[PDB]
Each structure stands twice: as structure tokens, then as C-alpha cells.
Amino acid sequence: ANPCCSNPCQNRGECMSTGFDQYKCDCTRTGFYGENCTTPEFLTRIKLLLKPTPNTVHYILTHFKGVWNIVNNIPFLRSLIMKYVLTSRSYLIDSPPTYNVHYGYKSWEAFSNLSYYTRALPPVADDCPTPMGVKGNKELPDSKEVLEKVLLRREFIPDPQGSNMMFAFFAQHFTHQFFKTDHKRGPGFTRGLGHGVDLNHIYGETLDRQHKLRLFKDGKLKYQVIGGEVYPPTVKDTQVEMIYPPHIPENLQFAVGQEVFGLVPGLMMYATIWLREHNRVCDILKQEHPEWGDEQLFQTSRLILIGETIKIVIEDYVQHLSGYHFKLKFDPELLFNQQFQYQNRIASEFNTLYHWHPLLPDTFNIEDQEYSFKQFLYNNSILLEHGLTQFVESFTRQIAGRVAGGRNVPIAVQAVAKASIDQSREMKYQSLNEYRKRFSLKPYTSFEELTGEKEMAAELKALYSDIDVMELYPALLVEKPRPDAIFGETMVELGAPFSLKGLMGNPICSPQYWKPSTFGGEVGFKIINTASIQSLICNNVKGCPFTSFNVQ
Amino acid sequence: ANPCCSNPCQNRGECMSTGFDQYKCDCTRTGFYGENCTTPEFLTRIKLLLKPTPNTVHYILTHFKGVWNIVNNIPFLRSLIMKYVLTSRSYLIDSPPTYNVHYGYKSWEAFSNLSYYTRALPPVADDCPTPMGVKGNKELPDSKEVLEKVLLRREFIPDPQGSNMMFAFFAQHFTHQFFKTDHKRGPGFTRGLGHGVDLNHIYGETLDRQHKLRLFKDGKLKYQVIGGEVYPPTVKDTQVEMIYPPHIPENLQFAVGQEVFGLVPGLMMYATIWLREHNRVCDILKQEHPEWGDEQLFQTSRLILIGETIKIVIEDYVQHLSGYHFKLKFDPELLFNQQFQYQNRIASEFNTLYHWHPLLPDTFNIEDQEYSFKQFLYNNSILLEHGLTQFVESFTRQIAGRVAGGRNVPIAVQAVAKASIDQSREMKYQSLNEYRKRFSLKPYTSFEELTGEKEMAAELKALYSDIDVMELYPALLVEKPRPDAIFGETMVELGAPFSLKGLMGNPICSPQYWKPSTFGGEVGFKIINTASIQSLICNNVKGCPFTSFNVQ
Numbered sequence A, B: 001a002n003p004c005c006s007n008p009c010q011n012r013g014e015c016m017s018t019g020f021d022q023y024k025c026d027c028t029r030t031g032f033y034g035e036n037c038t039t040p041e042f043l044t045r046i047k048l049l050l051k052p053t054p055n056t057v058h059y060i061l062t063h064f065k066g067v068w069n070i071v072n073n074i075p076f077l078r079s080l081i082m083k084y085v086l087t088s089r090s091y092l093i094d095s096p097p098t099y100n101v102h103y104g105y106k107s108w109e110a111f112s113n114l115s116y117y118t119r120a121l122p123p124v125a126d127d128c129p130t131p132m133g134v135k136g137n138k139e140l141p142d143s144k145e146v147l148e149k150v151l152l153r154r155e156f157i158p159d160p161q162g163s164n165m166m167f168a169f170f171a172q173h174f175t176h177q178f179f180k181t182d183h184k185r186g187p188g189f190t191r192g193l194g195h196g197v198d199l200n201h202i203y204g205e206t207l208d209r210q211h212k213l214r215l216f217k218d219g220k221l222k223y224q225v226i227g228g229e230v231y232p233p234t235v236k237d238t239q240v241e242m243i244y245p246p247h248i249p250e251n252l253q254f255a256v257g258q259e260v261f262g263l264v265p266g267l268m269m270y271a272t273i274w275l276r277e278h279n280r281v282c283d284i285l286k287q288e289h290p291e292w293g294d295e296q297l298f299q300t301s302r303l304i305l306i307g308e309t310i311k312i313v314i315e316d317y318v319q320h321l322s323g324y325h326f327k328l329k330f331d332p333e334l335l336f337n338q339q340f341q342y343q344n345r346i347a348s349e350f351n352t353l354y355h356w357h358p359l360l361p362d363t364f365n366i367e368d369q370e371y372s373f374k375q376f377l378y379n380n381s382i383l384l385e386h387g388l389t390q391f392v393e394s395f396t397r398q399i400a401g402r403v404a405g406g407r408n409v410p411i412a413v414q415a416v417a418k419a420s421i422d423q424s425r426e427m428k429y430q431s432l433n434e435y436r437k438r439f440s441l442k443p444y445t446s447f448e449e450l451t452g453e454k455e456m457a458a459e460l461k462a463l464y465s466d467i468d469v470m471e472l473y474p475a476l477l478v479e480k481p482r483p484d485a486i487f488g489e490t491m492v493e494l495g496a497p498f499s500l501k502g503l504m505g506n507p508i509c510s511p512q513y514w515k516p517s518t519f520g521g522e523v524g525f526k527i528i529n530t531a532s533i534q535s536l537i538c539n540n541v542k543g544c545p546f547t548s549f550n551v552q
């Protein structure tokens, strides 16, 4: 019934009803005018001509390795390029944030209520005739059918980019600080009220939890020593709430910042590494500042680890994922003469797209062992069994699954994939093609264009009938990958903006924060500016084993 | 003992201890270098020469009325000037915010914990030898002594700028949405978690309170009709908590957004006016949007009232206070090509400086009556007695007290003034002169320079001994006024930055919000862009009585 149900307004124009069956588009600052904001302004037409497609740019970034080799070595050139990747991306994100699952129009409630995930696109109104607005049938295709026909893995498909298990578990661990759905409220709600990289997954969401985790000497976090090795403390010792099945012995109930991290030994591996890093940085700071107390050692270390985290995410993690020959750089100063909002709100869609479960192998291979999901889940004995060094060595060698390209979701986790589909609908997501437009990409004109093949395309076509009715989440996992890449166009073009915004939007990246004194001086500052996934493991894992995010 | 106790670093350089008795200043981006950031960079020296003092600029703004008359009528010129007043002010505020009462160094706790007021200057460390750091005696002068000698009113001193009671009560009402100290926690904590102009003082801090206040038809707020006039509903009808002495009859316990607003009839006057405005705007929107439901009518109206509020504050309220011949403008677009953070955190110091109780008269004069404080407080019968029209007429005629200049704090409220002194100290405020430097003003070199007279100066000198030990709050109320002005230099130069930042930092001022559709279309948008204190009163008060922030 809502006359905006067809999503009439193009180019980021906003639709507003002007009567029971009339609408109007607000084209303010879109660069277009006309009833649906589809008539371009002169200068807009120019820009459109001189604008290369994302696939073109991606090609240039992943080719001409010889040129990039030169560029990467000319500091002012590298800075110029990175500044452009930062700025071009962030303009795609609304900041201050706008919509959420309950508000398809701006409101103080949607702005002020931090318990919601924000929305890059507003929900389809409740009184629209179809799930996607006006197109398609009264009901989307059976989600089980979609799951089984195009999502579920038959044979394991490895990632051509060589992503390993160190990568997979880093992705899970890192993102699960800001992807923390409040299932008590619903899929559109979050428990991560910092809406970003605050390391609550190490330190805790709340002050009370943090204090239980802290030693209150030398700024350190509590820990225990088992077989000469440092591990997180127990629930019994700390009284912090953790999720564990009832059969887990108390001496194996490790207590960490994120209550869910005991559920996978790969998570507990990173939990342990970072715990160690924190206490390590505490020793460094105490040496520089024998005058400092516990609070200041703890707080400064946390700030340093936030910096290390962002550093590693950009220059190692995203570097690997991108396949760019251009060398990405973590440098807050690049934005100082630029318009940029030092804030962020986690988007529901960012969460949805990040369900990268195809990464998971059929078994987890540590040393001589090959563990099944059943044996791997909630099983910290495995970690104690082999130890950190062996986890790193093994996980660095084991290849992860390809994410886009279709049919690679492990059966063990099929319920999670079905829930991603069902909850997207529950949250009234607009279609894949609406999202594509929202991020300046060309709508797909057929299912075959989407997948780049014929078989899955045909199954999808029989299910959905209309490409404009296809759903974002299934599309992401079925999309034609970039050549020999882990992802297709839509994953990168939505993901990159959300990501860089949450990284650079952090307050430590602001001018008043980004200076040596913030981090206890030049020594603390250097820890951030030289951080890497390798140094993180070298300093904190016995034997300083070699590591990487790609299979060697 | 802390080597930074003496506030060694100048020009916004940051002090960090580097050993039990050594310190270092971080001069990053200050424009200076050297041990204490006192050596200017070349370009810094230039700028310093070409920079007029705040007193010079103030003079130019309050003179040459004939030129301003021309400028005010050249749209592009007016915009240019207002853009400059906006930008020059906001660079004085740290955003994202930094310190608070418990953290004299940056921390994630101080950044993330919204329950604290932020701090423009860090607190004096607990182990410093004197209250102000290293200067002065082990103890500040008796606050009762300061109160009595230089703060308390002997004879009422009227405001030379002609501020009236409409102004006084607007200031109280408006600011008490973001000045809401959480006395359960301490003076450095706030209950206003929106940290700005969110109109929680009309709508409530929390969703629960809001819903009790709402009618849930046509987007409106509950109300009652008494003698044909619209007033807020009762506590009995709504169950919203309000602070009222036990002797107040339930039918006089008006329920409004801000629990403390029943305490002064002048507050309840504005509460009633704004309640009316909201329901008024609801009627307008319903007429434009018969398709809209209650939620959308309510939320859109709230957004419109936020706009009206900022509009009136800049163009009427601040316009009056400034004494400028230049016509200030509320125009978000002025910042769109500028670097600016659409966020804000309420500063403790902004709260402290806004204790403008000298505004209060010895009696409140309504019609033929002259009420004492005793009779005026918690007495809503007076409002019912005379009605809104008579309140507006009377309060528009009654002159308010001068704030700076000394000895004009009403005795009835002496406990509040003493608390301002005592709580400042409790919160470990740095000295007046530190705050002056912090806002690019020249330190006062004597008490006589501060007051511009001899008698109070001599009393202050005997009390404090050293000008560098003088306190911010008492200094503000004792400072030499600008010629025939309500305030001295320090009030304006600290207040203006804090204020404009909270006004323009509101999300509705951001590009994605500042468009017609946000406000239900051109008709809702116009309500904001034509708002004035006179139109607010004219649309909402019977007879459309004349009003102004100044005596006629």
C-alpha cells in the first residue's frame, strides 16, 4: 500500500509518501533531478564518463605488478593512492547513521538507540505486497531449497587465493567483537555498543566484566600457567560468565572477553595470543614508566592493542584478501586534511555479508590429527594437547574454503546458513540488485550473469523467476568470483566501505589521539606502527614459528 | 610528585611523565616545539601577528552598525562571516572527546563511558602538592568566604543588555536537557546520555518514559485541558516520575519530559509551550500526510522541534546574548565543504560556566503580584492562576540580573553558588588562567585586571594571594564585563565553542539528514527555517502576545 514500496527513487534519492497513493523523491545532493532522481546534472554526466567500473579498478590493482613495485617504494605516491582508497570508499557510508530494522525513515530513535545494527538500505515496509516491495511472488522461495541447491558443499572447494586457517579464525575472532547479535531482542539488535574495534572481545563489554578479567597489578590481565604455558584464567577463578556446554570441566572453562570464544579452539587460540600481547605490552610500558600505576598501564596497553589490531587488519588481513599488488597502509594522517567522520555504527548488512562459513574445512587438521566438527567444537583439550606453537604451524598450512562461487557451505553448519537467509527476510532486506545500486554497481540482468555459469543459475532462476527478486546473502555465496579470487564484486564493494569506515573511524585515528603521548610515548607508538600478524605470533608463541594468512 | 603537576606544556602540548621526576611534552601539531612547546614554528609566528584578540573582534562585531547593516543584506557575505564564526570556534573543542574527571590521560574508558561529562582540561592529579598543581597554598580559600565577599548580591544589578525573564527561563529550560548531573554518581557524571539537543526534556531520556508521555494518536503527546487551556498531563494519569514536594496535590503534579521541571513555574511555562508546539506540528504533518501513522508523526515532529530549537537558540537567543550587529544564521550547509565532526560530548566546564543564577531577580513579578522565591518554587498554581499569556507578558517586561561584574548572586540560592565552588574543586579543576590559555586568551596578571575594579580585587587578592591560583567559576561571575555587557571575555570565549559545537554537531545538521524529506517535506522543513521565539509564542499562546529576549 505504501507508494514507496517499489523503491522508485534512484541514485540515493529518498522516497516519501505524499498521500495514500502518491510519492515524492528528494534528490537533494544526489547529482540528479526528475521525478525519480534519474536525470543527471551536467557535471554529473562528466563524472559518470570518467568513472571506471569497480572491475576495471580491481584489474589494475591486481595487475602491473612491476609498476606497483615502483609505486609501493615512493612514499608520497603510496600515500596518495591509499588516501584515495580510503576516501572513495567512506563516501558510500551514511555517517551519522540513519535507518534500522524498525525505521525506514530517519528518526531520533534510529539515530540514538545504540542497541540496533544500522541499515545501509531501509527495510521494505510491512504493508508492501511482496517481500521485496512490489516484485516477485507473495513469498520468497523455500530457504531450505535455496540452501540445498546452491549453498551446500558437495566437494570441498579450496580458496584459490590460498587463505589458510590462521586467516579463517582471525576473521571470526576479530569480527566477533562487533558482530554480537542480541538474540533476546532479534536479528536487528547488537550487544556490541562500541560499534567497532574496541577489543571488548579481550577486555569485556562492561566495566564489571573487565575488572573480573584484570589482575590489578602492572596493568595486566589475569592468566594461568599450564605446562609452562600462559593461558586465560578459568571461570571458577574469575566468575566471568562464559558459554560452555554442561559437560565441560571447570578447569577447562577458560574465561575471556567474549563469552562465546570457548566454543572453538581456533578462537581460544587467538584469545590466548592477544592476552599474551597485552601483558607483554604492559611489561614494555612499565619499563618506560616505572612511575605509572596499574590503571594507566592497563588503559594505555588497551589503546596500543587497538592500534596493532587496525594495523594488522589493513596491512596483513585486508592486504591478503584484496590480492592487490599495491601495498595498503595504516596511516591516520592521510585523512587529516580530508573530510571524514570519526565515528561508526555497525551495519546489519555488514554482519550478513560476513557470514563466511564456506571458509571452514571438512576437518580441522592439527599435527597428525584430523578433527571433525563434533570433536573440534567446545574442545579446549585439543588446544592444551598440541599447544599454541603447533596450532599456528598447522593452521598456517591448512587451506580454507572459497567463499563466493557457490556450493561450499559445510553441511555441519547448514542451520547457520539457513538462518542467515531466514533472518535477512525477517529483517525485510531489499533485493541484491537494490543493494548493488546502493553501492554504485550495475544491477545483474540474469542469474547467469550473477554466477558466471549455467547450472546454479538455472536452479536459482526456477526458484526466484526474476533476477530483481534475488536475495543479497545467497547471491554473495553464489556470485562469480573475481579471477582466482575468494570473493565476487558485490562482497568487496559493500564490504570494503563498511570495513574501512569502522577501522579509520576509531577515535585513536583522530588527530587529538594519533600522537605518541596517547600510547605512552614513541616506544608505545612504535608497537602500533610496526605491528604485523607475524610479529604478533613471534613475540607471543613459543619458538616464534613462521605464520601468514596464506598457505605457503 | 607527578612531574606534570605544574602544567609545564604550553599551547596544547601534552605532558607525559618519563620517570618519577621527569616529564616530556608532546608538541605534535601544536605549531610549536621545544621542551614545553613554547618555541613557535615560522608559519606559527606569522599567524600570531595577524591574529586579532577576542576583545578586538568583539568590538568590531558590536560596532560599525552601518556596515553590518549592509553585510547582513548580502547573503553570500553573511554566509561567509557565519561560516567563519562556526569554524574558528569549533577548532577549540576536542572531538572525539578526551579527558574526564577520572582520566588526565586518554583512555578507552574516558572515550567510551557516556555517563561522564567530558573535560576541556584534564583534572589536576591527586598526588599534586596543591589543589591547582604546584602553585598556591595546600588549601584553596574558604568557599563561604569567596561566596560572601564577592558573589552574593547586596543590591540587584540589572543586565545592561536588557535580558528579561523570558530569556532567563529559556536558558534554564533549554540547557537543562543536557545539564543533568547524576548526583548519585558525582558532579562529573551526567544523566543526559544524548550529550546535546535531543529534547529529552520534552520527550524523556528513555523509551519507557516517552511512551508514558505519548497519546499514541496522531503522533501527539498527552495533555489536559484546564479552564479551556492546554497543559501537560498529571503524574497520576501518566505514571511518569516527577520531583515534587509531598504537599503538592496530585492534580498539580504536571508530568513532562524533565523530572525537575515542576520545581519552577517558569520552567513549566516553557514545558507547556513546547508541548503545544509538538501537537501543533503533528496537526500540520497529518494534514500533509494523511497516510502516516502515529509513530512517524511523532518521530518527524520531534525532529522538526529539534530544528526549531537550534534555529531559535542561534538566531534569537545567542543573537541577543552576543550583542552583535552581525545577524547570526542557522544554516547547516555552511559546514558541508568544511572539516567538522557531527558529534559532541557535554563538557563539565560548560556546565560549570552556565550557572547563571545572577540572572534571577529578588522577586518574580507576574501581573500585579510579586512572588518571593519561597512562594514561586514548586508552585504551579501561579501558572494556572495567571495563565500562559500573562506569564509571557510579565516575563517579557521583567529585567534579569547581570551575570559577570560581581556580587549579583541571589541570597536565596547561595547554597547553589557555594556548591559550584566546592564541586569544581572536588572535580580537581585547573585554574582560571590555565583555562584562559586553553582557549587562546591571555592569562590575567592581577586581580584588578580580572575585575576591572579595586574593592573585590583586593578581597580576592587577600584570599588567593596569587592570580594564577584564582578559580574559574568565581572568576566568571566577578570578571569585568564587556562594555554594557552581561558577560566578560572568559565566559564568551569558553562558552561559544562548547555551544556552537553542540548545536551544529547534532545529526540533523549532517548532509544526509539536512534535507526536506527528513522533516516530512518542504512544509516541515519550513517550520524549522522560519522558527523564532516570537513565532513559537505566537502559534502557541492565546492572543499571540509580543515577546522578546529583551526588555522593551
Ligand code: HEM
Residues within 6 Å of the ligand: A168, A169, A171, A172, A175, A179, A180, A181, A264, A266, A351, A354, A355, A356, A357, A359, A360, A377, A413, A415, A416, A419, A420
Ligand atoms: C569455526 C567454526 C564456526 C562455527 C561452528 C560457527 C557457528 C556459528 C553460529 C551457530 C552462528 C549463529 C548464527 C545464527 O544466528 O543462526 C554464527 C554466527 C556468525 N558467524 Fe560463524 N561459525 C564458525 C566460524 C565462523 C567464521 C570462520 C566466520 C567468518 C568470519 C564466521 C562468521 C560469523 C558471523 C559474522 C556470525 C554472526 C555473529 C553475530 O551476529 O552474532 N563464523 N556462527
Ligand code: HEM
Residues within 6 Å of the ligand: B168, B169, B171, B172, B175, B179, B180, B181, B183, B264, B266, B351, B354, B355, B356, B357, B359, B360, B377, B413, B416
Ligand atoms: C529559577 C529558579 C532557580 C532555582 C531555584 C535554581 C536552583 C538550582 C539548584 C538547587 C541547582 C543544583 C541542584 C542540584 O544539584 O540538583 C541548580 C543547578 C543549575 N542551575 Fe539553577 N536554579 C534556578 C534558575 C536557573 C537559571 C535561570 C539558570 C540559567 C541557565 C540556571 C542554571 C543552572 C545550571 C546550568 C545548573 C547545573 C544543573 C546540573 O548540572 O544538573 N538555574 N539550580
Ligand SMILES: *[C@@H]1O[C@H](CO)[C@@H](O[C@@H]2O[C@H](CO)[C@@H](O[C@@H]3O[C@H](CO)[C@@H](O)[C@H](O)[C@H]3NC(C)=O)[C@H](O)[C@H]2NC(C)=O)[C@H](O)[C@H]1NC(C)=O
Residues within 6 Å of the ligand: A113, A114, A115, A116, A184, A185, A186, B206, B207, B208
Ligand atoms: C532500543 O530499541 C529497542 C526496541 O524498541 C528497545 O527495546 C524495547 O523496549 C521496550 C520498552 O522498554 C520493551 O517494551 C515492552 O513493552 C511492554 C508493554 O509496556 C512491557 O510489558 C515490557 O515489559 C516492555 N519490555 C519488555 C522487555 O517486555 C521491549 O520489549 C524492548 N525490547 C524490544 C526488543 O523491543 C530498547 O529499549 C531501546 N533502547 C533504548 C536505550 O531506548
Ligand SMILES: *[C@@H]1O[C@H](CO)[C@@H](O[C@@H]2O[C@H](CO)[C@@H](O[C@@H]3O[C@H](CO)[C@@H](O)[C@H](O)[C@H]3NC(C)=O)[C@H](O)[C@H]2NC(C)=O)[C@H](O)[C@H]1NC(C)=O
Residues within 6 Å of the ligand: A206, A207, A208, B113, B114, B115, B116, B184, B185, B186
Ligand atoms: C562509567 O564509569 C562509572 C564510574 O567508574 C561506572 O560506575 C561504577 O560501576 C561500578 C561497577 O560497575 C560500581 O562499583 C561497585 O562495585 C562493587 C564491587 O563489586 C559492587 O559490589 C557494587 O555493586 C558496584 N556498584 C555499586 C552501586 O555499589 C560503581 O558504584 C559505579 N558507579 C560509580 C560512580 O563508580 C559505570 O559503570 C560506567 N558505565 C559504563 C557503561 O561502563
Ligand SMILES: CCCCCCCCO[C@@H]1O[C@H](CO)[C@@H](O)[C@H](O)[C@H]1O
Residues within 6 Å of the ligand: B148, B152, B153, B154, B155, B411, B414
Ligand atoms: C542583603 C544585603 C547583605 C549582602 C551582603 C552579604 C554578606 C554576607 O553575609 C551572609 O549573608 C548570608 C545570606 O543572608 C547569611 O546566610 C550569612 O549568615 C551571612 O554571613
Ligand SMILES: O=C(O)C1=Cc2cc(Cl)cc(Cl)c2O[C@@H]1C(F)(F)F
Residues within 6 Å of the ligand: A085, A089, A318, A321, A322, A323, A487, A491, A492, A493, A494, A495, A496, A497, A499, A500
Ligand atoms: O575488512 C574486510 O573484510 C575487507 C576489507 C577490504 C577493503 C578493501 Cl579496500 C578491499 C577489500 Cl578486497 C577488502 O576485503 C574485505 C571485504 F571487502 F569485506 F571483502
Ligand SMILES: O=C(O)C1=Cc2cc(Cl)cc(Cl)c2O[C@@H]1C(F)(F)F
Residues within 6 Å of the ligand: B085, B318, B321, B322, B323, B487, B491, B492, B493, B494, B495, B496, B497, B499, B500
Ligand atoms: O550558547 C550560549 O550560551 C552562548 C553561545 C555564544 C556563541 C557565540 Cl558565537 C557568541 C556568544 Cl556571545 C555566545 O554567547 C553564549 C556564551 F558563549 F555561552 F556566553
Ligand SMILES: *[C@@H]1O[C@H](CO)[C@@H](O)[C@H](O)[C@H]1NC(C)=O
Residues within 6 Å of the ligand: A006, A007, A008, A035, A036
Ligand atoms: C519513475 O520513472 C518514471 C518517471 O520518469 C515513471 O514512469 C515511473 O513510474 C517512476 N517510478 C517507477 C518505480 O516506475
Ligand SMILES: *[C@@H]1O[C@H](CO)[C@@H](O)[C@H](O)[C@H]1NC(C)=O
Residues within 6 Å of the ligand: A374, A375, A376, A379, A381, A382, A385
Ligand atoms: C576433545 O579433544 C580431545 C583431545 O584431543 C579428545 O581426546 C576428545 O575425544 C575430544 N572430545 C570430543 C567430544 O570430541
Ligand SMILES: *[C@@H]1O[C@H](CO)[C@@H](O)[C@H](O)[C@H]1NC(C)=O
Residues within 6 Å of the ligand: B006, B007, B008, B034, B035, B036
Ligand atoms: C619549560 O620552560 C623551560 C624549558 O625551555 C624550563 O626552564 C622550564 O623549567 C620548563 N618547565 C617549566 C614548568 O618551567
Ligand SMILES: *[C@@H]1O[C@H](CO)[C@@H](O)[C@H](O)[C@H]1NC(C)=O
Residues within 6 Å of the ligand: B374, B375, B376, B379, B381, B382, B385
Ligand atoms: C502558591 O501560589 C499561590 C497562588 O498563586 C499563592 O497564593 C501561595 O502563597 C503559593 N504557595 C506558597 C506556599 O507560597
